[PDB]
Amino acid sequence: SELLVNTKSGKVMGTRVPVLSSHISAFLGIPFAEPPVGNMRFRRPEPKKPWSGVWNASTYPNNCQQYVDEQFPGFSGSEMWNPNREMSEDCLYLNIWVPSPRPKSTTVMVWIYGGGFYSGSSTLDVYNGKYLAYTEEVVLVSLSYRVGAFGFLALHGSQEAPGNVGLLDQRMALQWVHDNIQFFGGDPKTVTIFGESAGGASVGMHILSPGSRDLFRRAILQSGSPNCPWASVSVAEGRRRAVELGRNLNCNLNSDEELIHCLREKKPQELIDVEWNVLPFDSIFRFSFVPVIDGEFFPTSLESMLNSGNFKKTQILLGVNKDEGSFFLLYGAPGFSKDSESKISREDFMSGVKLSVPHANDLGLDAVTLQYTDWMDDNNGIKNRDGLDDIVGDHNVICPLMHFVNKYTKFGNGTYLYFFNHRASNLVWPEWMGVIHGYEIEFVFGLPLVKELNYTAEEEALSRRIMHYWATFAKTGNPNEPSKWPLFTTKEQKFIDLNTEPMKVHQRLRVQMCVFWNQFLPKLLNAT
Amino acid sequence: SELLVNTKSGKVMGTRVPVLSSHISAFLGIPFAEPPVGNMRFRRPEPKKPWSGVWNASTYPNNCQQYVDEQFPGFSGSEMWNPNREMSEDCLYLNIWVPSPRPKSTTVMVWIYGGGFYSGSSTLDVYNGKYLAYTEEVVLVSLSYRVGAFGFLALHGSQEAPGNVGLLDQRMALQWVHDNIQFFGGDPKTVTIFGESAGGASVGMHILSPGSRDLFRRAILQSGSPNCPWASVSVAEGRRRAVELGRNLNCNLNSDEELIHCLREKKPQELIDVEWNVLPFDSIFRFSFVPVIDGEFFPTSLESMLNSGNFKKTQILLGVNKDEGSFFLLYGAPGFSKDSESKISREDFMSGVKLSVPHANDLGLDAVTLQYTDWMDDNNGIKNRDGLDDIVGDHNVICPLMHFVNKYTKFGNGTYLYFFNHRASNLVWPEWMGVIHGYEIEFVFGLPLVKELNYTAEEEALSRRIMHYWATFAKTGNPNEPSKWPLFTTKEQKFIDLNTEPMKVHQRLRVQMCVFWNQFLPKLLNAT
Numbered sequence A, B: 001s002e003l004l005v006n007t008k009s010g011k012v013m014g015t016r017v018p019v020l021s022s023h024i025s026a027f028l029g030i031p032f033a034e035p036p037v038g039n040m041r042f043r044r045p046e047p048k049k050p051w052s053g054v055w056n057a058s059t060y061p062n063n064c065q066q067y068v069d070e071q072f073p074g075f076s077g078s079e080m081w082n083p084n085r086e087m088s089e090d091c092l093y094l095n096i097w098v099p100s101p102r103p104k105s106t107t108v109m110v111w112i113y114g115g116g117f118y119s120g121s122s123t124l125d126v127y128n129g130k131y132l133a134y135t136e137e138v139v140l141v142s143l144s145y146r147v148g149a150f151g152f153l154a155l156h157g158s159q160e161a162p163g164n165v166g167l168l169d170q171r172m173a174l175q176w177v178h179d180n181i182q183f184f185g186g187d188p189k190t191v192t193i194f195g196e197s198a199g200g201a202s203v204g205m206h207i208l209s210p211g212s213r214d215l216f217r218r219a220i221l222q223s224g225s226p227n228c229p230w231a232s233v234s235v236a237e238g239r240r241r242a243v244e245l246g247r248n249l250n251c252n253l254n255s256d257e258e259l260i261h262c263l264r265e266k267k268p269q270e271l272i273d274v275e276w277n278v279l280p281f282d283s284i285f286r287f288s289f290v291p292v293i294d295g296e297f298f299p300t301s302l303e304s305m306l307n308s309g310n311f312k313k314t315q316i317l318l319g320v321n322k323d324e325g326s327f328f329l330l331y332g333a334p335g336f337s338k339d340s341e342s343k344i345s346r347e348d349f350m351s352g353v354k355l356s357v358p359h360a361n362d363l364g365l366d367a368v369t370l371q372y373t374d375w376m377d378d379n380n381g382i383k384n385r386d387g388l389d390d391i392v393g394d395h396n397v398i399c400p401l402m403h404f405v406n407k408y409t410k411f412g413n414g415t416y417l418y419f420f421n422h423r424a425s426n427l428v429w430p431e432w433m434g435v436i437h438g439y440e441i442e443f444v445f446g447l448p449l450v451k452e453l454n455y456t457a458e459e460e461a462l463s464r465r466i467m468h469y470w471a472t473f474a475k476t477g478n479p480n481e482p483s484k485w486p487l488f489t490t491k492e493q494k495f496i497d498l499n500t501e502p503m504k505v506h507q508r509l510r511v512q513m514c515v516f517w518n519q520f521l522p523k524l525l526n527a528t
């Protein structure tokens, strides 16, 4: 049977799924790690014990325990990101979509979901891999990994909660794909890992980490990079947040063993209920439990690794969206709201910049404010709103990705950079938010191909070229079929716009603002 | 006789001069102070002893001792600024142009020449007051004052060389005009002092100084303001430059009396020969001997005086030129030269910014460089040249004048601001220098009215409207004849362009760059 596959870990039985009036096989909920429950909470994952019999993989697995967005109850714009399966600590599973008939040895793509390392699910409708598997003939895999304190509580020096275990969950899934994907028709020597936001930062983290490098071939990073200011913390800060979490739960804090033991008896929801109380500052675009620069998964600081070429050399394809920051302002900055144009007063602008660069002294806040204010029209509400939108996006996503791409390209074997600026005709979010963080995903996964979702014919065409650029790059290391997406080089720094208009090539994506965020501001904060 | 005038100091005999095929009277070289020679060098000026008989005022007086520009021998562009009379320490005289027939009580304008407080003459062809006296029916006066060490050597605490004596020379001339101008037909209750560059800074200094305020009615400042970074130094820095000057002449430095005595025996040219050796930094647009914030002429810091309204409240008219910095780069920054377009390399740009902001640490130099560099085209030679031109002009002239005008307007009784951007059709300087520091002067003094100077008909019309704006403002406190130059207000901040095209009104002259120079950079240099 086409739906039965024998792996090194046991046999699994998939299910047949319809796709664009045809069909493919899906193997949903395959376990790749032992359930990280009880005494196993906070620990490195352990490989799944092989099973006898047949594993039923006809349905989506549970999602990992996480905070749930209730800001706009039933609004599809925000609920499309919430877990759509029951939550459980028993959540380490992966999903596979396989073309029909079963390939022999074709291109593999492994998706790593975003969600600020505190949320995310591999089962969201926007991540349904059937359209991409089908249209491009690739074996598509989506893995899962522990988020929040369950995945990133870090007490460096302890083996019970070493930190980075969520990243180790991702690695374990990649080890499973390396070891078993050949049985589903995938070529384990041609796997591309791709992800968005925290997922793109994760992808970049595996390019960096010695222990993950050999488990994949090429990489795609969407709106995220490893050096993002919100993607990692030092071991001292990780330790301090772990202790502060225990303090919120009235834990005995005399020793790591006491803290960890106390944290292990709490129900999942108790940790989720106070998780956000450990941030050191009043901030936006910062998350409590994230990867730690531990000297193991990351041997040295990310910057020295980037500087010395200490990373996997291969091809990468990556890019950003036009308005990466808008949704973080909607959720956390005064003056922004879902149902108004959100013209911002000068005082809310100033309140907005303090929230955006939480780690800055007064001089730093003045430098950011001067850099983004039009002083001949400072009370322009639209300009204040847009300026703040760009500050959040430039500082949290764009400039850190541009710093990564320039450092990577000096040692890599090929880079393709894009700027996604198409605002979907059917967007449910207000206009002011523009081309939102996460909204290039539906095009990568091909939702515009399904008529009922109401996209335009040109939106369907855009989705088909992106899907084909992504799969062709996964297959060959080049998005182009032998009108050309040129290679990004350290000399020319070319990139393309990705929208419904004839491809345009540009150069030096946001150089002006990024010299400010990547060179001047850090120099300024370090001296003052 | 029309050419004979009796003053409180004695009788003076003028000469009749032709002007635009008519004539007026000129009283050249009237003495207003005792010669500041011998033991009087460096001291406050003393009033001229009255003389019996008739003072011959038919010829220009000597110019004060100063450094002489020899960079382009015989080039009219630079020689038009050099002294055109023999030099002498005996140089405290004033000149008067009087309409014919002799007025009874008309508007008086007193010109104070620029020249960085180290040079300048009241006798330059560009300062000939006959055209303005004639066309606008005003009594035009040009005074003189000691420059360089002779006028500004400052050893605070000593009465032998207290500093600011050159400013006291100007004051003495204003006291003479107040006391005697009625005999030449001038109204001493309606005198406007006006000046350019160091002369405009001086004008602003008399608006500030309690001891000078009552001696004039209204003021005009051209490309200069009192708070310019090159226009004053602290008493400790003045002292240090005086000592360093003595050290260059092998003077005994044990006491002020020893230093001063030694400096008084040196010939004038010996002081001029080493004068430039005392600057504390490798700089551009900085001069050795300038006014000192002494607690007497300036009771407190200029900024606290501006902040508290501690200054003369009246009407002012002032403005700047488009390319104030170009000539200082020509003379002192690598890569600029008179006969080439002066496209500047990135390294010369960087060398240029270090010279321009001599008082800045590394962080400050980076902030200036980032603010003026187009990072998507950083090797553009024209952009590097123009960027440096704007850095010099914004920092040395424009932004300090804009800070002065906004502080003044909160307490004053009327402000008119202009932006002079007409490049003269007959300019002998290369194109790259644009609308040069000092080149609005020939229009204020009406040289375009004389056919042989080869200006265009529209240039003659522009000169006539400027002359009439200046004299009408001198007469009434408003440049407009009862198309309107609007009042600058702290709310609207309107100003006009001054050129051959139909008047255009704008707002917030260089606000963007000036928030950088006036608020951010000083905050940055003070913290780091």
Ligand SMILES: c1ccc2c(NCCCCCCCCNc3c4c(nc5ccccc35)CCCC4)ccnc2c1
Residues within 6 Å of the ligand: A067, A069, A077, A078, A081, A114, A115, A116, A118, A196, A197, A275, A276, A327, A328, A331, A332, A436, A437, A438, A439
């Ligand atoms: C108390 C108070 C606040 C919080 C909190 N506040 C987070 C607000 C900032 C974050 C809210 C965004 C929702 C994620 N969902 C979204 C994601 C993406 N794009 C989105 C676009 C629009 C709206 C939501 C999006 C792209 C892929 C990743 C996920 C979190 C946890 N616990 C708390 C506890």
Ligand SMILES: c1ccc2c(NCCCCCCCCNc3c4c(nc5ccccc35)CCCC4)ccnc2c1
Residues within 6 Å of the ligand: B067, B069, B077, B078, B081, B114, B115, B116, B118, B196, B197, B275, B276, B327, B328, B331, B332, B436, B437, B438, B439
């Ligand atoms: C050794 C080395 C250098 C110097 C020095 N170097 C000054 C260079 C910088 C200054 C040179 C400019 C000439 C003034 N003459 C000019 C003035 C104005 N505009 C001008 C425009 C173009 C050229 C000259 C101008 C507007 C009114 C004020 C005077 C000075 C003394 N001693 C020295 C001794």
Ligand SMILES: *[C@@H]1O[C@H](CO)[C@@H](O)[C@H](O)[C@H]1NC(C)=O
Residues within 6 Å of the ligand: A056, A057, A058, A059
């Ligand atoms: C597979 O498991 C799901 C669990 O809901 C069930 O509905 C389905 O019938 C199962 N099929 C088999 C063959 O066990």
Ligand SMILES: *[C@@H]1O[C@H](CO)[C@@H](O)[C@H](O)[C@H]1NC(C)=O
Residues within 6 Å of the ligand: A412, A413, A414, A415
């Ligand atoms: C990638 O590597 C191959 C083989 O080492 C080399 O020939 C090619 O030029 C490289 N391509 C890029 C983009 O550097």
Ligand SMILES: *[C@@H]1O[C@H](CO)[C@@H](O)[C@H](O)[C@H]1NC(C)=O
Residues within 6 Å of the ligand: B056, B057, B058, B059
């Ligand atoms: C005035 O002085 C000048 C000095 O050069 C002289 O040429 C002129 O003849 C003098 N006239 C009188 C009346 O003394």
Ligand SMILES: *[C@@H]1O[C@H](CO)[C@@H](O)[C@H](O)[C@H]1NC(C)=O
Residues within 6 Å of the ligand: B412, B413, B414, B415
């Ligand atoms: C100047 O002062 C007069 C009289 O004090 C006043 O009436 C007038 O409004 C003032 N004008 C300005 C420009 O402030």
